[PDB]
Design a protein around this ligand. Structure first.
Ligand SMILES: CCCCC/C=C/C/C=C\C/C=C\C/C=C\CCCC(=O)O
Length: 255
């Protein structure tokens, strides 16, 4: 019955709002247009005054900032996952496995909410780092964000809102096809119900948007592609920068 799917969609949106302090709705209000104006970093000097206004060479300081943020995001995504009905009843090992593989796919999904074609919000939306400035960073740091911007521009053309994204990131987490899953079936049973919830949500929220459900699911391919490209870039850094710390929580995820 659709009444149960709407209850599920409302539950997850409620938990999404409780778990993720910077929503897409707030991100868009900041990015578009007096109290919410970000400071804008587009070079080293603006970065210099930015570190003052908002708050080791430039590329590395930016890189570890990303690390700290990703860790914070993992923590938010973990909190959100525990609210997905059934998730915490799964085998403990499968819970770790689902988070291990799902966490970066969600990060890039939600990172798009903070992006437009020209740059990305930072520091809880207080700042805005331009795409060009990041693309101009020393090799191989200048290659990190561009694939993410490329995805975001197309993903954002779907015009999903937070209530759509709450169900969609839940679908990503409950993927029965992650390597090493000990009991696939209860995961798939949760995802099927999440998939039913998503389907009804997009049909009601986007009545004119034909086959949005199918297009959103095909986007899960771009997400996988971004991860593997990102993993390769990290292995270059581990050898180029033997003095540079990578956070152990992220180390364990990438293992
Ligand atoms: C919205 C809250 C404020 C965030 C402040 C952002 C600081 C860094 C700026 C841009 C990048 C944003 C997120 C990190 C993305 C990928 C992390 C790569 C490290 C890894 O996982 O291997």
């Amino acid at each position: 019955e659709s009444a149960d799917l709407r209850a599920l969609a409302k539950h997850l949106y409620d938990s999404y709002i409780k778990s993720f302090p910077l929503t897409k709705a707030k991100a868009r209000a900041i990015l578009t247009g007096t109290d919410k104006s970000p400071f804008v970093i587009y070079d080293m000097n603006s970065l210099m005054m930015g570190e003052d206004k908002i708050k080791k060479e430039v590329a590395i300081r930016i890189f570890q900032g990303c690390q700290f943020r990703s860790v914070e995001a993992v923590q938010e995504i973990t909190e959100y996952a525990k609210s997905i009905p059934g998730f915490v009843n799964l085998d403990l090992n499968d819970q770790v496995t689902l988070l291990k593989y799902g966490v970066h796919e969600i990060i890039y999904t939600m990172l798009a909410s903070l992006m437009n074609k020209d740059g990305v919000l930072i520091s809880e939306g207080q700042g805005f780092m331009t795409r060009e400035f990041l693309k101009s960073l020393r090799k191989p740091f200048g290659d990190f964000m561009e694939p993410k911007f490329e995805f975001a521009v197309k993903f954002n053309a779907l015009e999903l809102d937070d209530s759509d994204l709450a169900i969609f990131i839940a679908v990503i987490i409950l993927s029965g096809d992650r390597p090493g899953l000990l009991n696939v079936k209860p995961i798939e049973d949760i995802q099927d119900n999440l998939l039913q919830a998503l389907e009804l949500q997009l049909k009601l929220n986007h009545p004119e948007s034909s086959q949005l459900f199918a297009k959103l699911l095909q986007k899960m391919t771009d997400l996988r592609q971004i991860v593997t490209e990102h993993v390769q870039l990290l292995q270059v850094i581990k050898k180029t920068e033997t003095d540079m710390s990578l956070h152990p929580l992220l180390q364990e995820i990438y293992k």
